[PDB]
Amino acid sequence: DNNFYSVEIGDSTFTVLKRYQNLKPIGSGAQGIVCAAYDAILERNVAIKKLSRPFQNQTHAKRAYRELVLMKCVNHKNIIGLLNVFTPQKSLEEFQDVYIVMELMDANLCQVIQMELDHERMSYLLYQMLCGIKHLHSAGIIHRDLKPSNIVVKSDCTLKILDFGLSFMMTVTRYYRAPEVILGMGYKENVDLWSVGCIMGEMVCHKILFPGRDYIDQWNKVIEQLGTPCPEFMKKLQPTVRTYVENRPKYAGYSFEKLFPDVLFPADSEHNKLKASQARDLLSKMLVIDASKRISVDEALQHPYINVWYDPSEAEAPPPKIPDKQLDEREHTIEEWKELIYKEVMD
Ligand SMILES: NC(=O)Nc1cc(-c2ccccc2)sc1C(N)=O
Protein backbone atom coordinates (compact mmCIF):
# COMPACT_ATOMS: atom_id res chain seq x y z
CA ASP A 1 0.00 0.00 0.00
CA ASN A 2 0.98 3.70 0.55
CA ASN A 3 0.39 3.20 4.36
CA PHE A 4 2.09 -0.26 4.50
CA TYR A 5 5.42 -2.05 3.87
CA SER A 6 6.58 -5.67 4.02
CA VAL A 7 9.53 -7.30 5.81
CA GLU A 8 10.34 -11.04 5.99
CA ILE A 9 10.35 -12.34 9.59
CA GLY A 10 11.72 -15.88 9.11
CA ASP A 11 9.35 -17.70 6.71
CA SER A 12 6.57 -15.16 7.54
CA THR A 13 5.63 -11.80 6.03
CA PHE A 14 4.92 -8.86 8.34
CA THR A 15 2.96 -6.18 6.42
CA VAL A 16 2.83 -3.26 8.90
CA LEU A 17 1.94 0.47 9.01
CA LYS A 18 5.03 2.60 8.05
CA ARG A 19 4.99 4.16 11.58
CA TYR A 20 6.42 0.75 12.82
CA GLN A 21 10.09 0.29 12.02
CA ASN A 22 13.05 -2.02 12.74
CA LEU A 23 10.89 -5.17 13.28
CA LYS A 24 12.67 -7.85 15.36
CA PRO A 25 11.16 -11.31 16.24
CA ILE A 26 10.84 -11.75 20.03
CA GLY A 27 8.51 -14.74 20.10
CA SER A 28 5.92 -17.07 18.62
CA GLY A 29 2.64 -18.64 19.70
CA ALA A 30 -0.02 -20.92 18.17
CA GLN A 31 -1.82 -17.64 17.11
CA GLY A 32 1.24 -16.11 15.38
CA ILE A 33 4.66 -14.39 15.60
CA VAL A 34 5.41 -11.35 17.77
CA CYS A 35 7.87 -8.63 16.73
CA ALA A 36 9.47 -5.84 18.76
CA ALA A 37 9.29 -2.65 16.66
CA TYR A 38 9.92 1.05 16.96
CA ASP A 39 6.83 3.23 16.68
CA ALA A 40 8.14 6.49 14.98
CA ILE A 41 4.99 8.46 15.92
CA LEU A 42 4.84 7.63 19.66
CA GLU A 43 8.70 7.45 19.68
CA ARG A 44 8.65 4.25 21.75
CA ASN A 45 9.19 0.53 21.23
CA VAL A 46 6.12 -1.67 20.72
CA ALA A 47 5.21 -5.32 20.34
CA ILE A 48 3.24 -6.31 17.17
CA LYS A 49 1.49 -9.70 17.15
CA LYS A 50 0.50 -11.00 13.73
CA LEU A 51 -2.70 -13.18 13.80
CA SER A 52 -2.68 -15.13 10.45
CA ARG A 53 -6.22 -16.07 9.28
CA PRO A 54 -7.62 -15.92 12.92
CA PHE A 55 -11.08 -17.02 11.70
CA GLN A 56 -9.40 -20.28 10.39
CA ASN A 57 -11.03 -22.49 13.08
CA GLN A 58 -13.39 -21.86 16.06
CA THR A 59 -10.54 -22.17 18.65
CA HIS A 60 -8.32 -19.46 17.01
CA ALA A 61 -11.43 -17.37 16.21
CA LYS A 62 -12.92 -17.32 19.78
CA ARG A 63 -9.43 -16.53 21.14
CA ALA A 64 -8.79 -13.73 18.56
CA TYR A 65 -12.30 -12.27 19.14
CA ARG A 66 -11.98 -12.41 22.99
CA GLU A 67 -8.45 -10.84 22.76
CA LEU A 68 -9.67 -7.93 20.54
CA VAL A 69 -12.88 -7.25 22.59
CA LEU A 70 -11.26 -7.44 26.09
CA MET A 71 -8.10 -5.45 25.11
CA LYS A 72 -10.39 -2.64 23.81
CA CYS A 73 -12.55 -2.41 26.99
CA VAL A 74 -9.93 -3.10 29.76
CA ASN A 75 -7.69 -0.29 31.03
CA HIS A 76 -5.68 -1.58 34.02
CA LYS A 77 -1.92 -1.16 34.64
CA ASN A 78 -1.53 -4.99 35.15
CA ILE A 79 -3.31 -6.06 31.94
CA ILE A 80 -1.49 -5.50 28.59
CA GLY A 81 -3.01 -2.45 26.89
CA LEU A 82 -3.94 -2.18 23.19
CA LEU A 83 -1.99 0.64 21.44
CA ASN A 84 -3.30 -0.16 17.93
CA VAL A 85 -4.92 -2.76 15.70
CA PHE A 86 -4.83 -2.98 11.93
CA THR A 87 -5.16 -5.20 8.86
CA PRO A 88 -3.18 -4.54 5.61
CA GLN A 89 -6.09 -6.09 3.62
CA LYS A 90 -8.35 -3.55 1.86
CA SER A 91 -11.67 -5.49 2.22
CA LEU A 92 -13.58 -8.37 3.86
CA GLU A 93 -13.03 -10.61 0.79
CA GLU A 94 -9.25 -10.03 0.88
CA PHE A 95 -9.19 -9.96 4.78
CA GLN A 96 -6.55 -12.38 6.07
CA ASP A 97 -4.40 -11.05 8.93
CA VAL A 98 -4.92 -9.02 12.13
CA TYR A 99 -2.04 -7.11 13.75
CA ILE A 100 -2.26 -6.20 17.45
CA VAL A 101 0.12 -3.47 18.74
CA MET A 102 0.86 -3.49 22.50
CA GLU A 103 3.40 -1.80 24.80
CA LEU A 104 6.77 -3.54 24.66
CA MET A 105 7.86 -5.19 27.93
CA ASP A 106 11.49 -6.22 28.70
CA ALA A 107 10.95 -9.88 29.52
CA ASN A 108 8.47 -12.59 30.27
CA LEU A 109 8.29 -14.42 33.64
CA CYS A 110 10.11 -17.56 32.26
CA GLN A 111 13.26 -15.32 32.29
CA VAL A 112 12.47 -13.86 35.80
CA ILE A 113 12.04 -17.49 37.10
CA GLN A 114 15.73 -18.09 36.20
CA MET A 115 16.67 -15.31 38.70
CA GLU A 116 16.78 -15.25 42.48
CA LEU A 117 14.51 -12.40 43.54
CA ASP A 118 14.63 -10.33 46.76
CA HIS A 119 11.21 -10.32 48.62
CA GLU A 120 10.45 -6.70 47.65
CA ARG A 121 10.53 -7.62 43.87
CA MET A 122 8.98 -11.05 44.41
CA SER A 123 6.06 -9.73 46.51
CA TYR A 124 5.57 -6.71 44.14
CA LEU A 125 5.42 -9.01 41.03
CA LEU A 126 2.95 -11.30 42.84
CA TYR A 127 0.80 -8.31 44.03
CA GLN A 128 0.52 -7.08 40.37
CA MET A 129 -0.46 -10.54 39.10
CA LEU A 130 -3.24 -10.70 41.74
CA CYS A 131 -4.44 -7.09 40.86
CA GLY A 132 -4.64 -8.07 37.18
CA ILE A 133 -6.52 -11.30 38.04
CA LYS A 134 -8.82 -9.46 40.54
CA HIS A 135 -9.66 -6.93 37.77
CA LEU A 136 -10.52 -9.79 35.35
CA HIS A 137 -12.72 -11.45 38.04
CA SER A 138 -14.61 -8.13 38.78
CA ALA A 139 -15.75 -8.16 35.06
CA GLY A 140 -16.73 -11.88 35.15
CA ILE A 141 -13.50 -13.08 33.44
CA ILE A 142 -11.87 -16.19 34.94
CA HIS A 143 -8.45 -16.53 33.23
CA ARG A 144 -7.89 -20.31 33.86
CA ASP A 145 -4.78 -20.34 31.50
CA LEU A 146 -2.26 -18.25 33.46
CA LYS A 147 1.35 -19.42 32.93
CA PRO A 148 4.78 -17.67 33.14
CA SER A 149 5.03 -17.19 29.31
CA ASN A 150 1.81 -15.06 29.30
CA ILE A 151 3.04 -12.67 32.02
CA VAL A 152 5.51 -9.91 31.09
CA VAL A 153 7.83 -7.64 33.12
CA LYS A 154 9.57 -4.25 32.63
CA SER A 155 12.95 -3.04 34.09
CA ASP A 156 11.23 -0.99 36.85
CA CYS A 157 9.53 -4.29 38.08
CA THR A 158 6.09 -3.45 36.55
CA LEU A 159 4.09 -6.55 35.52
CA LYS A 160 1.42 -7.22 32.90
CA ILE A 161 -0.77 -10.18 32.07
CA LEU A 162 -0.63 -10.79 28.22
CA ASP A 163 -3.82 -12.73 27.59
CA PHE A 164 -7.35 -13.45 28.83
CA GLY A 165 -6.91 -17.23 28.79
CA LEU A 166 -10.30 -18.53 27.53
CA SER A 167 -10.93 -27.31 21.67
CA PHE A 168 -9.05 -29.18 18.83
CA MET A 169 -6.46 -27.55 16.49
CA MET A 170 -3.28 -28.73 14.69
CA THR A 171 0.24 -27.95 16.11
CA VAL A 172 2.37 -26.34 27.84
CA THR A 173 -0.28 -24.68 30.09
CA ARG A 174 -1.01 -28.08 31.74
CA TYR A 175 1.67 -27.59 34.48
CA TYR A 176 -0.32 -24.62 35.83
CA ARG A 177 -3.80 -26.26 35.64
CA ALA A 178 -5.72 -26.58 38.90
CA PRO A 179 -6.93 -29.98 40.19
CA GLU A 180 -10.54 -29.02 39.32
CA VAL A 181 -9.57 -28.45 35.63
CA ILE A 182 -7.41 -31.69 35.57
CA LEU A 183 -10.25 -33.78 37.11
CA GLY A 184 -13.01 -32.06 35.03
CA MET A 185 -15.10 -30.84 38.00
CA GLY A 186 -15.90 -27.26 36.99
CA TYR A 187 -14.27 -24.20 38.54
CA LYS A 188 -14.69 -20.98 40.52
CA GLU A 189 -12.66 -17.70 40.42
CA ASN A 190 -9.87 -19.15 42.66
CA VAL A 191 -8.92 -21.66 39.87
CA ASP A 192 -6.56 -18.75 39.00
CA LEU A 193 -4.97 -18.80 42.52
CA TRP A 194 -3.76 -22.35 41.89
CA SER A 195 -1.90 -21.04 38.79
CA VAL A 196 -0.42 -18.14 40.83
CA GLY A 197 0.72 -20.74 43.43
CA CYS A 198 2.42 -22.73 40.60
CA ILE A 199 4.06 -19.59 39.26
CA MET A 200 5.12 -18.38 42.75
CA GLY A 201 6.53 -21.84 43.64
CA GLU A 202 8.53 -21.77 40.37
CA MET A 203 9.80 -18.17 41.09
CA VAL A 204 11.17 -19.53 44.44
CA CYS A 205 12.62 -22.93 43.39
CA HIS A 206 13.43 -22.12 39.66
CA LYS A 207 11.83 -25.32 38.36
CA ILE A 208 8.34 -26.24 37.16
CA LEU A 209 6.54 -27.55 40.32
CA PHE A 210 4.25 -30.08 38.56
CA PRO A 211 5.81 -31.06 35.19
CA GLY A 212 3.28 -33.73 34.13
CA ARG A 213 3.68 -35.30 30.65
CA ASP A 214 -0.19 -35.46 30.43
CA TYR A 215 -3.27 -34.97 32.70
CA ILE A 216 -2.88 -38.36 34.46
CA ASP A 217 0.83 -37.73 35.23
CA GLN A 218 -0.06 -34.08 36.07
CA TRP A 219 -2.41 -35.36 38.86
CA ASN A 220 0.38 -37.79 40.07
CA LYS A 221 2.88 -34.89 40.23
CA VAL A 222 0.38 -32.82 42.31
CA ILE A 223 -0.37 -35.64 44.82
CA GLU A 224 3.29 -36.64 45.25
CA GLN A 225 4.19 -33.11 46.50
CA LEU A 226 1.00 -32.13 48.35
CA GLY A 227 -0.41 -35.49 49.33
CA THR A 228 -3.58 -37.43 48.61
CA PRO A 229 -6.54 -35.03 49.18
CA CYS A 230 -9.15 -35.32 52.02
CA PRO A 231 -12.17 -37.73 51.64
CA GLU A 232 -14.30 -34.48 51.64
CA PHE A 233 -12.58 -33.69 48.24
CA MET A 234 -13.14 -37.26 46.83
CA LYS A 235 -16.96 -36.91 47.43
CA LYS A 236 -16.97 -33.88 45.06
CA LEU A 237 -15.73 -36.04 42.18
CA GLN A 238 -17.99 -37.67 39.50
CA PRO A 239 -18.07 -41.50 40.03
CA THR A 240 -15.74 -42.31 37.05
CA VAL A 241 -13.14 -39.74 38.35
CA ARG A 242 -13.81 -40.59 42.10
CA THR A 243 -12.95 -44.23 41.28
CA TYR A 244 -9.70 -43.28 39.40
CA VAL A 245 -8.49 -40.80 42.12
CA GLU A 246 -9.35 -43.18 45.08
CA ASN A 247 -7.46 -46.05 43.31
CA ARG A 248 -4.20 -44.13 42.90
CA PRO A 249 -1.14 -44.91 45.13
CA LYS A 250 -1.43 -42.92 48.44
CA TYR A 251 0.87 -40.00 49.21
CA ALA A 252 1.37 -38.16 52.53
CA GLY A 253 2.86 -35.12 50.76
CA TYR A 254 5.39 -32.66 52.19
CA SER A 255 5.06 -29.68 54.54
CA PHE A 256 5.65 -26.31 52.80
CA GLU A 257 8.78 -26.02 55.01
CA LYS A 258 10.20 -29.13 53.18
CA LEU A 259 8.85 -27.99 49.73
CA PHE A 260 10.13 -24.44 50.07
CA PRO A 261 13.04 -24.42 52.63
CA ASP A 262 14.86 -21.20 53.72
CA VAL A 263 17.79 -22.18 51.41
CA LEU A 264 15.58 -21.30 48.37
CA PHE A 265 14.77 -17.77 49.66
CA PRO A 266 16.74 -14.66 50.78
CA ALA A 267 16.81 -15.51 54.57
CA ASP A 268 20.01 -13.96 56.02
CA SER A 269 18.53 -10.97 57.94
CA GLU A 270 15.60 -10.91 60.34
CA HIS A 271 13.59 -9.02 57.66
CA ASN A 272 14.15 -11.81 55.10
CA LYS A 273 13.48 -14.63 57.58
CA LEU A 274 10.09 -13.08 58.39
CA LYS A 275 9.32 -12.53 54.64
CA ALA A 276 10.35 -16.17 53.83
CA SER A 277 7.90 -17.42 56.49
CA GLN A 278 5.15 -15.13 55.09
CA ALA A 279 5.88 -16.26 51.48
CA ARG A 280 5.73 -19.93 52.60
CA ASP A 281 2.34 -19.35 54.30
CA LEU A 282 1.01 -17.72 51.06
CA LEU A 283 2.27 -20.68 48.95
CA SER A 284 0.50 -23.02 51.38
CA LYS A 285 -2.89 -21.25 50.85
CA MET A 286 -2.63 -21.10 47.03
CA LEU A 287 -1.41 -24.69 46.36
CA VAL A 288 -4.49 -26.26 47.90
CA ILE A 289 -6.04 -29.12 45.92
CA ASP A 290 -9.57 -28.53 47.12
CA ALA A 291 -10.67 -25.21 45.59
CA SER A 292 -13.23 -24.71 48.46
CA LYS A 293 -10.31 -24.52 50.93
CA ARG A 294 -8.03 -22.46 48.60
CA ILE A 295 -7.20 -18.73 49.04
CA SER A 296 -9.33 -16.23 47.03
CA VAL A 297 -7.71 -13.27 45.15
CA ASP A 298 -8.87 -10.78 47.76
CA GLU A 299 -7.55 -12.85 50.70
CA ALA A 300 -4.23 -13.17 48.68
CA LEU A 301 -4.07 -9.41 48.09
CA GLN A 302 -4.65 -8.81 51.82
CA HIS A 303 -2.08 -11.47 52.88
CA PRO A 304 0.90 -10.12 55.01
CA TYR A 305 3.39 -10.94 52.20
CA ILE A 306 1.39 -8.98 49.59
CA ASN A 307 -0.52 -6.23 51.50
CA VAL A 308 2.54 -3.95 51.92
CA TRP A 309 1.79 -2.93 48.28
CA TYR A 310 -2.03 -2.78 48.57
CA ASP A 311 -3.51 0.16 46.64
CA PRO A 312 -7.35 0.20 46.16
CA SER A 313 -6.98 2.08 42.84
CA GLU A 314 -5.15 -1.08 41.62
CA ALA A 315 -6.90 -3.78 43.72
CA GLU A 316 -10.45 -2.33 43.70
CA ALA A 317 -10.38 -0.58 40.27
CA PRO A 318 -13.86 -0.06 38.67
CA PRO A 319 -14.60 -3.20 36.58
CA PRO A 320 -14.32 -3.03 32.76
CA LYS A 321 -17.63 -2.85 30.88
CA ILE A 322 -17.66 -5.81 28.43
CA PRO A 323 -20.42 -5.17 25.82
CA ASP A 324 -22.65 -8.07 27.03
CA LYS A 325 -22.62 -11.78 25.87
CA GLN A 326 -20.13 -10.81 23.04
CA LEU A 327 -17.71 -13.50 24.45
CA ASP A 328 -20.27 -16.27 25.19
CA GLU A 329 -18.36 -18.45 22.60
CA ARG A 330 -21.49 -19.45 20.62
CA GLU A 331 -20.56 -21.63 17.62
CA HIS A 332 -20.03 -19.64 14.37
CA THR A 333 -19.07 -20.69 10.81
CA ILE A 334 -15.60 -19.85 9.36
CA GLU A 335 -17.19 -16.98 7.42
CA GLU A 336 -19.23 -15.75 10.41
CA TRP A 337 -16.03 -15.55 12.58
CA LYS A 338 -14.22 -13.91 9.60
CA GLU A 339 -16.93 -11.17 9.62
CA LEU A 340 -17.13 -10.75 13.43
CA ILE A 341 -13.34 -10.35 13.64
CA TYR A 342 -13.15 -7.95 10.60
CA LYS A 343 -15.90 -5.73 12.16
CA GLU A 344 -14.01 -5.61 15.51
CA VAL A 345 -10.79 -4.63 13.61
CA MET A 346 -12.45 -1.91 11.43
CA ASP A 347 -14.69 -0.91 14.48
N1 LIG B 1 9.87 -9.40 26.08
C1 LIG B 1 8.76 -10.07 25.70
O1 LIG B 1 8.72 -11.28 25.82
N2 LIG B 1 7.71 -9.35 25.21
C2 LIG B 1 6.49 -9.85 24.72
C3 LIG B 1 6.33 -11.14 24.24
C4 LIG B 1 5.10 -11.43 23.73
C5 LIG B 1 4.68 -12.73 23.15
C6 LIG B 1 3.30 -13.01 22.99
C7 LIG B 1 2.90 -14.21 22.41
C8 LIG B 1 3.86 -15.14 21.98
C9 LIG B 1 5.22 -14.86 22.12
C10 LIG B 1 5.64 -13.66 22.68
S1 LIG B 1 4.10 -9.99 23.79
C11 LIG B 1 5.37 -9.04 24.55
C12 LIG B 1 5.24 -7.67 24.94
N3 LIG B 1 4.08 -7.00 24.78
O2 LIG B 1 6.17 -7.09 25.47
Side-chain angles (χ1 to χ4, degrees), residues 45-304:
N45 296 331
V46 299
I48 307 182
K49 183 195 269 169
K50 177 189 178 174
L51 303 183
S52 310
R53 292 196 73 84
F55 43 83
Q56 72 180 247
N57 66 52
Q58 303 218 59
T59 308
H60 282 257
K62 283 165 181 174
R63 183 163 175 199
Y65 196 63
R66 145 178 207 100
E67 211 186 325
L68 256 358
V69 171
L70 299 176
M71 275 182 95
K72 214 165 285 209
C73 75
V74 172
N75 186 27
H76 188 280
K77 69 211 288 186
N78 298 121
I79 307 285
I80 205 91
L82 178 82
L83 296 179
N84 206 0
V85 55
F86 59 88
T87 183
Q89 291 88 34
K90 300 185 181 190
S91 72
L92 178 65
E93 310 89 69
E94 296 158 293
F95 175 62
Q96 200 113 18
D97 314 307
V98 176
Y99 292 85
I100 294 165
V101 187
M102 312 165 257
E103 37 209 329
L104 186 69
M105 302 286 274
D106 308 316
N108 73 10
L109 265 201
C110 298
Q111 302 160 233
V112 177
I113 277 160
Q114 297 166 61
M115 323 177 329
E116 280 192 334
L117 287 166
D118 51 286
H119 304 275
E120 186 166 39
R121 281 181 235 273
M122 190 169 275
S123 65
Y124 187 57
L125 296 167
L126 292 157
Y127 165 70
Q128 296 177 86
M129 263 183 248
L130 290 160
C131 288
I133 291 156
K134 163 61 180 297
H135 191 70
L136 287 189
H137 290 180
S138 76
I141 302 144
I142 301 162
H143 193 296
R144 186 222 55 189
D145 213 83
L146 251 207
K147 61 207 185 158
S149 67
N150 65 23
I151 301 167
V152 286
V153 305
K154 229 180 161 57
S155 28
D156 63 354
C157 213
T158 57
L159 180 149
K160 295 180 204 285
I161 293 175
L162 278 183
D163 79 323
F164 304 91
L166 202 130
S167 193
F168 182 75
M169 55 154 277
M170 313 233 193
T171 308
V172 287
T173 309
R174 115 166 82 255
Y175 310 141
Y176 312 92
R177 295 284 171 89
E180 61 266 28
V181 171
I182 290 165
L183 305 180
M185 73 207 281
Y187 60 88
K188 285 242 175 293
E189 271 87 358
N190 75 1
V191 68
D192 286 331
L193 275 289
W194 172 274
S195 299
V196 177
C198 288
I199 294 159
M200 183 180 179
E202 202 172 324
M203 284 168 63
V204 171
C205 76
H206 324 282
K207 69 189 164 166
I208 295 165
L209 304 182
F210 318 117
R213 55 181 164 80
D214 53 66
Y215 277 56
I216 297 298
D217 192 45
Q218 197 52 46
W219 179 248
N220 292 308
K221 253 72 167 164
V222 170
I223 63 173
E224 280 172 345
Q225 298 310 314
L226 308 176
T228 298
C230 289
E232 289 71 35
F233 181 69
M234 307 295 196
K235 287 204 255 175
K236 307 203 308 150
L237 302 173
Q238 220 245 43
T240 58
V241 187
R242 191 179 200 275
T243 196
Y244 156 73
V245 168
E246 278 182 356
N247 284 286
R248 288 270 96 224
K250 271 86 164 285
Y251 303 94
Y254 299 92
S255 74
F256 281 83
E257 287 80 11
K258 290 170 132 215
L259 286 170
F260 306 107
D262 267 48
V263 300
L264 286 174
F265 291 95
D268 25 57
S269 60
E270 286 289 352
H271 177 81
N272 292 335
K273 273 181 187 155
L274 186 54
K275 290 279 137 209
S277 168
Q278 283 171 1
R280 199 145 48 228
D281 184 72
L282 183 56
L283 271 163
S284 78
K285 286 168 175 51
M286 288 173 163
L287 290 174
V288 173
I289 294 174
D290 188 347
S292 76
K293 293 166 184 181
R294 192 191 301 143
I295 198 157
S296 64
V297 73
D298 285 307
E299 286 165 1
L301 277 164
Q302 291 166 60
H303 184 280

Side-chain angles (χ1 to χ4, degrees), residues 17-37:
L17 287 162
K18 289 166 161 179
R19 67 185 287 173
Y20 303 121
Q21 288 153 210
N22 204 202
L23 291 237
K24 312 168 274 290
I26 63 165
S28 201
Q31 290 178 296
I33 305 97
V34 183
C35 280

